[PDB]
Design goal:
part of a larger assembly, 4 chains, A alpha/beta (465), C alpha/beta (497), D alpha/beta (444), C: 497 residues, GROEL, domain 2, GroEL, four-stranded mixed β-sheet, three-stranded antiparallel β-sheet, elongated, D: 444 residues, alpha/beta, GROEL, domain 1, 2 domains, three-stranded mixed β-sheet, 16 helices, T-complex protein 1 subunit epsilon (chain C), unfolded protein binding (chain C)
Amino acid sequence: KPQEVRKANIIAARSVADAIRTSLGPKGMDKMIKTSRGEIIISNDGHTILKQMAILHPVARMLVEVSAAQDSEAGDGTTSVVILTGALLGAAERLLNKGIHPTIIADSFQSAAKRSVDILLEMCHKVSLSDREQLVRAASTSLSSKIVSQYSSFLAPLAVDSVLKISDENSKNVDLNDIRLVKKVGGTIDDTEMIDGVVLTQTAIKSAGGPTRKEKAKIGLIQFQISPKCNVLLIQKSILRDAVNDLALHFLSKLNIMVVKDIEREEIEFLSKGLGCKPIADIELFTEDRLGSADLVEEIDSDGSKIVRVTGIRNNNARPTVSVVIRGANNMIIDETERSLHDALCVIRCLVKERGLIAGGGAPEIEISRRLSKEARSMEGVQAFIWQEFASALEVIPTTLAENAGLNSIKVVTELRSKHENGELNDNTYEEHILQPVLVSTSAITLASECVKSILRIDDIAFSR
Amino acid sequence: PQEVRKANIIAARSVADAIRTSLGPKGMDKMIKTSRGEIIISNDGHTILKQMAILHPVARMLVEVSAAQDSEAGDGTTSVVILTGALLGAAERLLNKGIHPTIIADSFQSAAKRSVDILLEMCHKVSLSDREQLVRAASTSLSSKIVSQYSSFLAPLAVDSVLKISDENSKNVDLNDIRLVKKVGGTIDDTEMIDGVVLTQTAIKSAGGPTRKEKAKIGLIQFQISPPEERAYLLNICKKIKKAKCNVLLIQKSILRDAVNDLALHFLSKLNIMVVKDIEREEIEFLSKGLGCKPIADIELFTEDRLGSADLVEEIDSDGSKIVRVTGIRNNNARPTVSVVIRGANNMIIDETERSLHDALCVIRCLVKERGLIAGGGAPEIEISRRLSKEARSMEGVQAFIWQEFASALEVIPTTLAENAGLNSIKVVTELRSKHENGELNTYEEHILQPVLVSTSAITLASECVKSILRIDDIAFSR
Amino acid sequence: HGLEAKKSHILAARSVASIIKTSLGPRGLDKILISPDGEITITNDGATILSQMELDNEIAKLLVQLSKSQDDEIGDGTTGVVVLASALLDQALELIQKGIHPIKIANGFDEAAKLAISKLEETCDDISASNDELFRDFLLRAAKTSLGSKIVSKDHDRFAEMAVEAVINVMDKDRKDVDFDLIKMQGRVGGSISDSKLINGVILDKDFSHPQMPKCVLPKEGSDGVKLAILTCPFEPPKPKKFKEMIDDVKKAGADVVICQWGFDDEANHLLLQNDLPAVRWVGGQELEHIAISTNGRIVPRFQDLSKDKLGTCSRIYEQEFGTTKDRMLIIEQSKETKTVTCFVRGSNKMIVDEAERALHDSLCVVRNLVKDSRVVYGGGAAEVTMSLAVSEEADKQRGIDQYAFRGFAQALDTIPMTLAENSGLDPIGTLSTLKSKQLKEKISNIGVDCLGYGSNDMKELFVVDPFIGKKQQILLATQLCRMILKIDNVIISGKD
Amino acid sequence: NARLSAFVGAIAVGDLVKSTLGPKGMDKLLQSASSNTCMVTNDGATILKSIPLDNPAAKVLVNISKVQDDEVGDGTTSVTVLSAELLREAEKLIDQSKIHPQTIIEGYRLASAAALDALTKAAVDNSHDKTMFREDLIHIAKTTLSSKILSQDKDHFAELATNAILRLKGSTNLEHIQIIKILGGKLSDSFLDEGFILAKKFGNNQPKRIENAKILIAFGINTFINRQLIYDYPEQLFTDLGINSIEHADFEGVERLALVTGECDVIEEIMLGEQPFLKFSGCKAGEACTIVLRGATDQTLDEAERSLHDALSVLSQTTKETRTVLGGGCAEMVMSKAVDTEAQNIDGKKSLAVEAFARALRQLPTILADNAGFDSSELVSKLRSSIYNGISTSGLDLNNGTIADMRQLGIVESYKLKRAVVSSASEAAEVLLRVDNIIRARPR
C-alpha cells in the first residue's frame, strides 16, 4: 500500500497545521514548547514555533523550509502559509477516495496558482515607488503591533528612505541582509543616523597612539592578525591568540595608519559585499587594488557608543549599502525595535519587487473562491472538480481569522460573500489602515502549491545510510 | 495435491508392513484388543484387517481386496496385502522423480496382464481328467490342519464333488452352493456325499412323528402351524397340504411363534407327513436352488408345481447327531449340489474341519477356471523378475523405469518367506537366483504345490488396488 | 449524546446505503432473497431488498419505514430516495463542523427542494399537449427499461401492451386514482410467458367441482350478462342457535353459478349437476368484495333476499386448461370497464414466475405515474444534473446562512449521476463535468448518464422519459426523511429480559 | 469480504470435481459421520449434491448443474470448471488490471459470440453415406462412455448404443429405451432387444406363451393390464375366461406401452437371472428398444445406469443436429483463436477482459493433460503452435503422448453439446460476477 503510507504522512501533516491554526493573527492562541535542554519559550509567531519544534517527521519538515522561504522572500505570512498548505492536503484526501492520481492533483495546482495570481492582480491597486506618502503609511501600521507606538513616527521615514536609495528601477529581488540594524546600548529612539556609506560593529583603539580618525582613507579587509598606502586596516577577531600586538600599535602610529581590530567574524562576509573589497588571507597576496575608498573616516560618539562611520565609498561594482543604527536605553528596546523594523523592511521589499497592494483580512480569499467556482464550469473532466475544491481550500484563512478573534465562525464568513458581491475590495480595512502587500498573498499561494506538490510526490520512504 | 496421496501411502504402508510379519505359518501373530474386552490371536490377514476397525478410508479397501482374495482364489490373503504395500512403497520414489500417478497406475495394469502369460508358459499343464494330481493336491494342503491320517480319505471326496459341478466351460462356480453341516458325535471316517441335499437340523422328537418317509415331496413354506375349535382350524391347514400330496414340511425358524402344534402332530401322523422345523434363514436361499422349489409365504400360494421330489427321506441313527438325508431330487431344471456332513466327538474338530475343507475346495476350483499349478516358496515371484530384467531394456520413456521397480517390489514376498523362517533374508534369495541358470521352477519333491489362480489373482487385485489408491487426491467431509 | 450520536448517525447511514449503491439502475445487482414463507425470487427492487434487511440500528430503520409508505405510492423509487437522502446527510456532516446547527440544515433543504421544483417545471415537457400520436409509444417503451434486465426482455413487446390496459381500466381520466388492491398479481408454475393473458375479473382458483358440469357458461338466448350467486351463509339445513328449497331460489333468480364462503356436501354436487349449475367453495372474505364490484352485483345476506338486480352479471365464464397443470382455473371477463383487473403470468419454473411477476408489477407502477401527470421529464441522470445547476447558480443570489445549505443541496444531487456512472463503467467525475458543459455553452437540454451501451451523449433522441410526479415524489420523501433523521439526537435501546 | 469469499469459495467447488473431468480422470472419495456410507464414484452431479456447502454463492452453481444434467446428463464437470476458471482470472482482472466489473460481463458477452462462430465454421456434417454418419455416432458414444467402468468393454459397447438409436427413427424422447439390470455374467454379455422385456410376470398359474394377444391398458382381449393389484377370486376367474391379467404396472410402464401399441402377435415368457421375464413379439411399428446390462455386483449396475442414460441422451440429440466437431482439447483450442482474432479491434477496458477468456479456454484441456500423466504446458503449447496459423486438424492425445489427428483416432464431439456448455457456463459466471455483497435474513 504505497498510497496508504502517504496518507499516514498527510494526517500527521494536518495535525501540525491544526496546531499552528490556533496561533494565526494577533489574537491567536499561544503555544507552550519545552525544549529538551530545559528552556521554556512561548510566542505566537509560527516561524519560531516550527523552528524549535524539532519535527522528526520527514514530510512535516517541509513546512519549516517553506516558512523559512516565506520570511526570506515576502517576510510575512509564515503562519498563514502553513494553514493554506493543510487545506490542500485535506481537500486531496477526498480526491484519493475517488480514484484520482496525485499527479493530476499536483498538476492542477500549477494552473490554479497561476490563475489565482492573475485574478488577484486585477483587483489589486497598482502603486509606484515614486510616491513617498504611500510607503510611510504602510510601514507605520506595521509598527502598531509593538509596544513602541508614539515613537514610531520617526521610524517610518527611516525605513522608507533607506530602500528608495537602493531601489533604483526594475531591481526585482532586493536583499535585506545588506541592510544591517545596529543595536547599541544607550541613547533613545528619536536619535538615529542613517550613514548611507556603511556602519561597523566595533569601536576604535583605546590605547595610546591611535589616531581614531583619518581623512582620505582606504579600508581593506584582512583576515590575518599581526602577533608575535593603507590608511585604515581591519583585523579579524581571534580569542585564541593575540589579535594585534601593542608594539604593532606604536609602529603603525608613527606611519599615520589607523587601526581597527577585533572585527567580528560574522561581519567579514557582510563587509566584503557592500564595500566591494576582497578578503586578504596572506600579506604576500596583499595589494592596493583590494582596498576601498573613503573620503573621511571619523569616530562619533553620541553617548558612550564610540562608533566609527564611513561615507562616500564611490565604488562602481559595489552599491550604496546602508546600515541602520538603532539606539535605546533598556535591552528590550533595541531588541523589539529590531524585529519591528525588520518586518517593516519586508513589507517595503514586497512593493519593490512587485508593485501594487491589497487590503488584508481575508478579503481577496473570498472573491477568488467565488470567481473560481463560476469559472470551474469552463473546464472538463477531473480537473474541473479540482477548481471547486481549490476554491473551498482558500476559505480556511479568512475562517480562522474569524475564529481566533472570538467572532462567530460561520456567521462572519457568510457576511464576507454577501458584501463582496456588490463592492470590490471595500471590506472596511482601508479605513482601519490594514494593508497587506500583494507579494505576500502571491508567495503564500505559490509556495503552498510547491509544498503540497513535494508532499504527494512521496509514495514511500526507506532507511538510507 | 500430493500431500493427500503421500499421507495415504505411508498410512497404508504401515498396515502392509504390520501384516507382512504374519506371512507363513511361522510368521508373527498380531493381537487386537476390542473395546468390549475381547482379544483374538491368529495369523489370518482377513481376520486382523476386519477386527482392526481402521479409521483410514483408503486403508479400508484392503479388507475388500482380502475378501475377494478368499472368495476367488481362496489363498494368499496375507500375500496380497504385502504385494499391495510393495507397490505403494516403490511408488514413494516414483513421486519424487516427478512422475504423475496416471502413468504409475496405467503401467501396473499393463504389467499385470503380461505377468499372467509369463506364468502360464512356465506352469505345468494338467487336466481334470487325471485324478492323481487332484488327490495329492488336497491331501498335502491338509498337513497344516489337525487331520493327518484321515485326510487321505477326505481328498477324493472333495475331488469328485467339484468334478460334477465344474463341467468344462462353466469356469467360476459358486462356493455357497456347497454346504458343510457340522454336528457333534460320530467321527471323521464316516462320510456321506448325499448329492440330493442335506439339511442343518434334526426332525420332530415328539410322539407320533414318523421321522421317515418314502416317495415324498419337498417344498419351502413360510407358514406356521399355530392355534388361532383349535383342532378344526388346524384340520383345514393339514387338508390343503394333503391336496398337493406334500409329505415333507419345511418351516422357517422364527422366535415369534412355535412351528407345529402338538395337536397337529397326531393329524399328520395318520397322513404320514414328515415335518422338519427350525430351518435357518441362510438355508432358505440354499433350498430354493438345488431343490428347484420356491418359498411360499401363505397357504394360498402353496401349489403342487412348486413341490419337488424325494426318493427316500429318513433320519439316520447316530450318536448325538440324528442327521436327515434326502436323495434323488429328480429335478432337470435345478442342477445338483454337494452337501457334506461333518462329524466328530469334540466341538473343536468339526469346526476346524469345516474351514480346512474350504481351502481344499478353493484350490481345486482354481484348476477349474485356469488349469495348471505353480510350485510355491517364492518361485513365481522370482521367475517374473527374471523375465522383466531383459524386457525392461526394450521399453522406452517413463514406463521403462517402472518395469525395473515393479520387479523389485515382487522380491518382497520371497524375502519375507525367508525372514519368517529364521533364515537370512538376502542369502536365501541369492541362492535361488544363482541356481536359476539351471533349474527353473525347482519344492516339487517336498509335496508343496500352489495353484496358478492364487498367484494370478494376487497380482491382479493388487494392481487395481494401488491403482485406485492413487486416484484419491482429496479427502472431504460429506454428510 | 450530542458530540457522539451526531457523528454515529452519519456513519450508520453510509454503511447501509453503500450496499445498494452498486444495485442502482438497470446495470445494478439482482440480489438473492429468501422469504420466511418459503418463496424464493431474484430481483433488484429496492422495496423488497430493504424490507428483507433487518438490523438493530435505529438510523437504518427509518429507511424501511419510509419505503413501506413509498411502496404504495411508487415502490420503484426506494433505491433512489435512500441514495439521495444519504447524500444530504454527507453534506450535513460538513455543515455541523462549520458551526451550523442541525435544525438549520433541516430548514435549509426545505427551501432548496421547493426552489428546485419550480426550475424543473420550466424545463419540463408535456405529452398530450405536444404529440398525441406518440402517446402509445411512450407507455410501451417506458416498461422496456425495467424489463431489460430480465428474461422478459425477449417477449417484452407483448407485455408492454398488457401493462397499459391494466392501469387505465382501474382508473378514471378525471380522478386518476389507481389502487394496488384493485390490481391482482397471480401466477402458477408451468407453461411459458408467451401464453400469459389479461383477465378482467377475479380468479378464485376453482375447478368447477365435478367435471361433468359445463366448463363454459352460455348466454342462454341473449340474456343479461351471466348471473352469479353470492351467499354469506353456509350451505346446510337451518338449525336453531331443505336442499331442494335453496336451489329453487337460485333457479328463480337466474344465477348460473353459486359462490359461497363455506364448503358443500356431496349431495349438493348431485342436484346442481342436473340443472347445470356449477358451484364455488371456500372463498375468502376479501375476494367477496371484488366480485360484486366488477360484476356490478350486491351482497345478499339471506337465502330469500336473492333477485335479478342483486346478482352480478359478467360477460361469460369459461374454464381454459393451462398446460399440464391440474388446477384448471377460471377466467371471468367483462365487456364494460370494471374496477378490478387481475394479471396472470406463467413460467417454466417457480423462480421464473416470481421474477416476471414483480417485474411486471414494477411496470404497472411506472405507468401509474405517467397517466397521473401528462408532463414528463427526461431521466437517466439528466434530471439530477439540471436541478443541481439551477440551485447552484441561485445559491450565490441567496445570502445568509442558508447560502451554504443551497450549495450542499446542489452537490448532493450530483451523487445520483455519479453513482450511475460508476455502475456503467465510466468516470463519475469526468462524466458529471461533461454533462454540465453540454447543458451550458451549447444549449439548455437534458442529457443524462448512459444506462445502455451507446456511442455518444444526448439520450433525448432515445425518447427515455420519467414521470414528473414520480421524480418529484422522490425529492420530497428524501427531504422529509433527512429532516426527521436530524430530529433524533439520541438512541435509546432497552435490554432484553 | 463477499467478493473474496465468492471467488475463492467457487474455486474450491471446481477443485473437488477437477479430477473427474476426462477419460483419464480420477475418482473422488467422500466420508460421512457414520463412515459406512463412503462410496467411490467420479460422477460430478453426485459430488456436488452430496457435499453440503455453507457458501451461498456456491449454491448457485449447484442448481445450474442440475439444469445441465436434465438436458444431457454429461459434461456437467466441464461447465463447473470453466465457470471456475473465469472467476479465477476475474480476480486478476479486477485488482491489478483496472477493469470495471460490468466490463468483464460485457467482455464475455462479445467473447461468447466469437466462440460460437468458431464452432459453427468448424462444424461439418455428412448427409450422404449414412454409413459414415453411423461411424460418427460410434465415436461420440466412445466419448460419452469414457471415465466409467464401461470403458473396458466400450469397444463392444460402441455398437450397442449406436445401433440402438438407429432403431428409433422418431421423437428424441428416451422413454422408448428401457434399461434392465440383472446380476451375473460379464458386461460384454449385454445385448440389444426390441421385444420390450418386462420384469414382471402375469397371473398365478397361466400359460407362458400367448399367441394373438390384444393388449388393453386399464371387450374380447387376451391380455389384461391393471395399475393396482388383483383380488384372488377374479384372478382365478380370468384364467377360465382366457384373459391374462398383468399387475404391478407403474406410471413409467404405462407411458412405455402407449408408445408401442392394442394387439401383439406373440408374448413369450423367458427365464433369465432367476426371475420371470416377458418378451413381446409382433408389435405394430415398434419404436421402443430394451437394453439388458449384466453386471457383477449391485454397485457396478448402479453406476452403469446413469452412465448409459447419459450416453443415449446425447446420441438422441445427434438426430436433430448432424454437425460434429473435433474434441479432445481441439474444440477448446479452435475457440481460443477466434477470441484473439476479434481482439484486434476492441476498446481499452474490454481488451484484457476478453483476452482473459482466451486463456480460460485453454485451462480445460490443461486439466485433461494433468490427469493423463503428461505435461500440460509442454503438450498444449506444441499443439497451439500448429493451430495458430492454419492447418488445424490434430488435437491432444491422452494415450501415446504425441500430437495426432482426432479424426484418425476416432475422437469427435457433437455440435449441440458444445454450444450448450459455452452458453450455460457463461450465464453461470455472469451471475457470480454481479454479486459484491450477500445479505441473509435471520432464520427462525
